Amino acid sequence: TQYPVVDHEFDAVVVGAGGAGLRAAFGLSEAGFNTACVTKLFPTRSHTVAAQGGINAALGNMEDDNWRWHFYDTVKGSDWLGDQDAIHYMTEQAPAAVIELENYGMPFSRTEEGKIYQRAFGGQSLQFGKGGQAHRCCCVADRTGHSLLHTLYGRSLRYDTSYFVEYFALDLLMENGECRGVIALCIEDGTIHRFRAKNTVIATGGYGRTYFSCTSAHTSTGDGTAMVTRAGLPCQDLEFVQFHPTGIYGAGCLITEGCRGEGGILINSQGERFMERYAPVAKDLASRDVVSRSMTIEIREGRGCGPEKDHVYLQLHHLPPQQLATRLPGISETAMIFAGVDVTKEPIPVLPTVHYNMGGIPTNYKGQVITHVNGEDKVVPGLYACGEAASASVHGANRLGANSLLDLVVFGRACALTIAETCKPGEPVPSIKPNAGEESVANLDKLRFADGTIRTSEARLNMQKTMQSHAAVFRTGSILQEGCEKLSQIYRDLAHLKTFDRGIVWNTDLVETLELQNLMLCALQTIYGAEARKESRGAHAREDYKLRIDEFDYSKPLQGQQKRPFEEHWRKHTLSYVDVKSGKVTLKYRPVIDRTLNEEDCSSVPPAIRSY
Amino acid sequence: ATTAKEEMARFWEKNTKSSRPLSPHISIYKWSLPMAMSITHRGTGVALSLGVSLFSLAALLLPEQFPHYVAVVKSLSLSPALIYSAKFALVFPLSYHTWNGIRHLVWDMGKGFKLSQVEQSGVVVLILTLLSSAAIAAM
Amino acid sequence: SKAASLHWTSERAVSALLLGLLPAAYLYPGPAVDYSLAAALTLHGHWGLGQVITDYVHGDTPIKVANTGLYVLSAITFTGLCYFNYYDVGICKAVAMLWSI
Amino acid sequence: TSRIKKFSIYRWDPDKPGDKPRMQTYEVDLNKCGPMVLDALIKIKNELDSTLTFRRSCREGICGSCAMNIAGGNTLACTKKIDPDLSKTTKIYPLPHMYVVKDLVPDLSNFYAQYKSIEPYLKKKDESKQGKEQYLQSIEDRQKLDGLYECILCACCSTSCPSYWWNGDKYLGPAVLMQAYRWMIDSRDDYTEERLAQLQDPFSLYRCHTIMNCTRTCPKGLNPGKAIAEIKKMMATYKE
Numbered sequence A: 001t002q003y004p005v006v007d008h009e010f011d012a013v014v015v016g017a018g019g020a021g022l023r024a025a026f027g028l029s030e031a032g033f034n035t036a037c038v039t040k041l042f043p044t045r046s047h048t049v050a051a052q053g054g055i056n057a058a059l060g061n062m063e064d065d066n067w068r069w070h071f072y073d074t075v076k077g078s079d080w081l082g083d084q085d086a087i088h089y090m091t092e093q094a095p096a097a098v099i100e101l102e103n104y105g106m107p108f109s110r111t112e113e114g115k116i117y118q119r120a121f122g123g124q125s126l127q128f129g130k131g132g133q134a135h136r137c138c139c140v141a142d143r144t145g146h147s148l149l150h151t152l153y154g155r156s157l158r159y160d161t162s163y164f165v166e167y168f169a170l171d172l173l174m175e176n177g178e179c180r181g182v183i184a185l186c187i188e189d190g191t192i193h194r195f196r197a198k199n200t201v202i203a204t205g206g207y208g209r210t211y212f213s214c215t216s217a218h219t220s221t222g223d224g225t226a227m228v229t230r231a232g233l234p235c236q237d238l239e240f241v242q243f244h245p246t247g248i249y250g251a252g253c254l255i256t257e258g259c260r261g262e263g264g265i266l267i268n269s270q271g272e273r274f275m276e277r278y279a280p281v282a283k284d285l286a287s288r289d290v291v292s293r294s295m296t297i298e299i300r301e302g303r304g305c306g307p308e309k310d311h312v313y314l315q316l317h318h319l320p321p322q323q324l325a326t327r328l329p330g331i332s333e334t335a336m337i338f339a340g341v342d343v344t345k346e347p348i349p350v351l352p353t354v355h356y357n358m359g360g361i362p363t364n365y366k367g368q369v370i371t372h373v374n375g376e377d378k379v380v381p382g383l384y385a386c387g388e389a390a391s392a393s394v395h396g397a398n399r400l401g402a403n404s405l406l407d408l409v410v411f412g413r414a415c416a417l418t419i420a421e422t423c424k425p426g427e428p429v430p431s432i433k434p435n436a437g438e439e440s441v442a443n444l445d446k447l448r449f450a451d452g453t454i455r456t457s458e459a460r461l462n463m464q465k466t467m468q469s470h471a472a473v474f475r476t477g478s479i480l481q482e483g484c485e486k487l488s489q490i491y492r493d494l495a496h497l498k499t500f501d502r503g504i505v506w507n508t509d510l511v512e513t514l515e516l517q518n519l520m521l522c523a524l525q526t527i528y529g530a531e532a533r534k535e536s537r538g539a540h541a542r543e544d545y546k547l548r549i550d551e552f553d554y555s556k557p558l559q560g561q562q563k564r565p566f567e568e569h570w571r572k573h574t575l576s577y578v579d580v581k582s583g584k585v586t587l588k589y590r591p592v593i594d595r596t597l598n599e600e601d602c603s604s605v606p607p608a609i610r611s612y
Numbered sequence B: 001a002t003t004a005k006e007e008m009a010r011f012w013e014k015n016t017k018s019s020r021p022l023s024p025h026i027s028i029y030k031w032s033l034p035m036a037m038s039i040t041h042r043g044t045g046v047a048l049s050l051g052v053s054l055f056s057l058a059a060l061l062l063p064e065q066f067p068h069y070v071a072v073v074k075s076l077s078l079s080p081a082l083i084y085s086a087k088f089a090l091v092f093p094l095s096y097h098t099w100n101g102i103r104h105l106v107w108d109m110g111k112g113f114k115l116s117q118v119e120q121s122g123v124v125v126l127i128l129t130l131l132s133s134a135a136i137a138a139m
Numbered sequence C: 001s002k003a004a005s006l007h008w009t010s011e012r013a014v015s016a017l018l019l020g021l022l023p024a025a026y027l028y029p030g031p032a033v034d035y036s037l038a039a040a041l042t043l044h045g046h047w048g049l050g051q052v053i054t055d056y057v058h059g060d061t062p063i064k065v066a067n068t069g070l071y072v073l074s075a076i077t078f079t080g081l082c083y084f085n086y087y088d089v090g091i092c093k094a095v096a097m098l099w100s101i
Numbered sequence D: 001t002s003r004i005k006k007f008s009i010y011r012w013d014p015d016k017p018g019d020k021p022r023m024q025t026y027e028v029d030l031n032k033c034g035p036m037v038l039d040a041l042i043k044i045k046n047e048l049d050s051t052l053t054f055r056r057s058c059r060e061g062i063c064g065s066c067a068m069n070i071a072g073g074n075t076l077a078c079t080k081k082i083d084p085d086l087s088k089t090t091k092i093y094p095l096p097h098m099y100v101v102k103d104l105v106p107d108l109s110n111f112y113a114q115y116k117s118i119e120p121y122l123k124k125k126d127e128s129k130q131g132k133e134q135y136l137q138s139i140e141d142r143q144k145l146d147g148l149y150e151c152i153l154c155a156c157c158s159t160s161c162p163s164y165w166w167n168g169d170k171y172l173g174p175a176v177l178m179q180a181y182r183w184m185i186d187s188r189d190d191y192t193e194e195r196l197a198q199l200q201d202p203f204s205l206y207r208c209h210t211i212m213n214c215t216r217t218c219p220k221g222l223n224p225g226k227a228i229a230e231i232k233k234m235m236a237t238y239k240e
């Protein structure tokens, strides 16, 4: 009624123009599909552009490698919450995926043979964890994401993909439990658009901005995760939040783990290289959940640096300045801009910082979104997800550095391949009721003219401080429960929201209130799932439940053990639902997939004690 | 979906008939010596050309030969200070354009593009312009 | 096919020539320099004002008019210089006489 | 204590189009604000006037979103230190000589389309073996791309160039031309002559008159002025 509606018919619609969304979008077009890519940002502004350290693949350019070692590292890294069929797919496809990007012109750094330069990175080994540090992180100095995204964007210019730039997706068009498109606001002119398609791909990124301190872009607001939640579908494993060990003190900007890959070390206020104590073998190249907890303990125990003893130091000045300028030039500039530090002379002040969301929309290894009914997974017809918004789950309870850029292009491609193997271009577009999406427009109209007593920035700050204080690196039941009660109150108080801009063209007051609704749905599920998970696994650490609780006790021999019933252990994915009008969170569980895609070619890795 | 040429045409059709203002430019942009010297190179070039054209025009139209007007001026017995000032004002735009022209020709050979070199070569051009003009005016 | 780069190259060549003719006018005044300056000044000036026109004049008809007028000015200008060189003392000696004031 | 800093900021609202562009002053306490201009902008929007509108995303000067004109020069708000002299008012404008969508948001769609027109992607004479093996590139050849591939496409340089002000419809501008050079000198690209032939006209390349505002203004420390001079040299010497 009050808003002009514009209807589009495509074969496929991709929401997102990051690494995943772009790869999916022109992968569909390269297969002949009439494809739309709807993005709230100009593509090269997406968070992918800020990625630094690189992308993993067992090319073997630096020494002999094997993708099954990368498989093993990822399984263990995930603390046996990762689905081993998807990890199999991802690590096996990794060499081909990186070669694709370089053949696109991605300007990788080079070896003396002219091949792609690979660096060490945290938590990667040769010989199934037995043979020391792998060197399989392919990089463009410390701007790998920048070059990845600009390369993919240029490539996308060769195909007939229709781009809808600065369009904000509001909801899915669901009919009969099937997705039939998305509805969105055109930020440039105020109009409402419905994109109808047989297949929809969600590639909207993470939701790190639910926290007060994060490496994430201002635009990382979980918009796609919230669309799924509003459709009544589950999200998965949202309580697993990655804290990166080295965000710069104060600003929060990321300092790449490539620094430690190239030989940098963490020291505390006494000059001690303290990771020698927390991880005798891996040292500062332990997994991120371990390094972050270790740094947090050093600070809790009085060995932090700075006037407030609230951070630690990353030292690079023992390295040759030529290596710093050639391998880490990006963070060299950043360190100077944001901390006044010359990395050839003085250390960088750093501390663990919310960085990446292991959870997301649950998918199978083909990229199809699933639900879980009567104890069985079921595909959602017409709905895909990839990138940081999805939970494939390749990362389980802790992602390995440089596996996310890999994830993006592998499963962006997989979504496209799956649709091309499932459908043909030009099949009839699914129908929608004439009023499909009206509740999204009505919600948009409520926030546009909202005139309560709690302005958006006030409730968003309340949410961020709550998450920072109640769901951090170490967690406990009573602090989680108070956080749950706080967020639930904040959610109810969205009824009293207050906005000021009454326009429709480029009303970022409105858009940020939509993003607040989305962030809050992600935060609620994150903290309620954390409160229910009474164990410690990967990035989720409970000081009241310190042990990982599996179906067996894998630190003892299995012979003669009684398997714990599914309801009496925690090696299972959390599925979360929200009743959006009340804010009531409901939690269910589904088993982890231990089988690979081919037992004979790549054996399943049983759970074991996880040490670095 | 749309070619670059199509995108540009849409851009101008949309904006030329919109209410959108053009954001300010010359009135808000910070000045620098290189930008000012660039404008002055153009200014002196045009001044020199209009000078040559005027002289060429005067030669065709004026009744007398050049030595006649030279003699008339010498007969007025103007102050040497005033004549020196006139010589300086004549040679200065030519001196600036010439030195700064060499600076352009060096840029066209690909040399001197570091910001520090850009600043330093401009200052050198200014000193060489004042020195040579002062020397030439006294001849 | 390479018209634009060729013109750019020609402009730089004439600029350098003008540069070489300055010292030549001081060391070897007379007819050869006098007419070479007439030609190089006219051509360097014509192309230079042409750049100014291309930068600032827009619209099909305004551009054609501006460039037509420039041709007229250039032709009159080169004609006067040659006329001055032939029926008068010439550019080189004109500058020396002017500076004897 | 408090350190109150004044910002005068360009305002224009497309939904109230008749209200001519104006400057609005905001007072910000620097003791309760981050050190960068973007910090002040976000603080103003969150606390003082939520109608103030600007593009931003990253925070560390890598995405290119927040380009605007601060204290007379084009730059990234997220890496531009606030001037702590409280007697001086900092004036903030959109990128110059651009169509304003709203407040500090310019229309970059011509800029992007000019970028598309130079085909900023790898082109080999035979692409049928794509995806099979790494192309080989020597360290020395890769080093030629340093200073070119780092561009974040913020448009600070182009919208500082007087030639782009007067002829932005036809002059590709420093950002796009330097990216054209980036693909010309990539040893893996086979289309150098064609990339050069594309510039054989009076405007695309040759409106550059070596003014050098582009290099002075680049927040990434790059030198598109030099890149443009290298094209001109290639243009003048490449065969056929």
Ligand SMILES: *Cc1cc2c(cc1C)nc1c(=O)[nH]c(=O)nc-1n2C[C@H](O)[C@H](O)[C@H](O)COP(=O)(O)OP(=O)(O)OC[C@H]1O[C@@H](n2cnc3c(N)ncnc32)[C@H](O)[C@@H]1O
Pocket: A015, A016, A017, A018, A019, A020, A021, A038, A039, A040, A041, A043, A046, A047, A048, A049, A050, A051, A052, A053, A054, A055, A144, A145, A167, A168, A169, A170, A203, A204, A205, A206, A215, A216, A217, A220, A223, A224, A254, A355, A356, A386, A387, A388, A389, A401, A402, A403, A404, A405, A406, A408
């Ligand atoms: C923060 C970060 C992460 C990171 C990194 C450095 C930083 C600072 N370095 C990495 C590295 O070296 N290697 C690596 O493997 N991972 C690294 N990461 C993590 C990784 O970069 C991210 O997880 C990944 O880049 C996320 O990619 P993805 O394609 O999933 O999403 P995105 O780049 O964040 O962009 C999301 C797109 O979705 C669109 N969007 C969002 N909401 C909407 C709505 N409402 N409507 C329409 N479109 C929407 C955005 O426009 C964006 O294009």
Ligand SMILES: CC1=C(C(=O)Nc2ccccc2)SCCO1
Pocket: B026, B035, B038, B039, B042, C055, D162, D163, D166, D209, D211
């Ligand atoms: C377009 C151009 C110049 C120009 O227009 N500069 C300029 C004019 C007005 C205000 C600032 C700069 S001067 C040097 C040759 O090229």
Ligand SMILES: O=C(O)/C=C(\O)C(=O)O
Pocket: A051, A052, A053, A054, A244, A254, A255, A256, A257, A258, A356, A400, A401, A402, A403, A404, A405
């Ligand atoms: O997240 C990753 O995979 C890698 C980084 O954040 C990094 O460059 O340190």
Ligand code: SF4
Pocket: D150, D151, D152, D153, D154, D155, D156, D157, D158, D174, D175, D178, D217, D218, D219, D220, D221, D222, D224
């Ligand atoms: S060259 Fe510099 S100023 Fe120009 S777009 Fe690239 S980063 Fe921005």
Ligand code: F3S
Pocket: D160, D161, D162, D163, D164, D173, D174, D207, D208, D209, D210, D211, D212, D213, D214, D215, D224, D225, D228
């Ligand atoms: S400012 Fe403009 S004129 Fe050339 S040197 Fe830079 S593109």
Ligand code: FES
Pocket: D055, D056, D057, D058, D059, D060, D061, D062, D063, D064, D065, D066, D067, D076, D077, D078, D079
């Ligand atoms: S916000 Fe990304 S460049 Fe400033």
Ligand SMILES: [K+]
Pocket: A357, A358, A359, A360, A387, A388, A389, A390, A391
């Ligand atoms: K995820």
Ligand code: NA
Pocket: D183, D184, D185, D186, D187, D188, D189, D190, D191, D192
């Ligand atoms: Na080449």
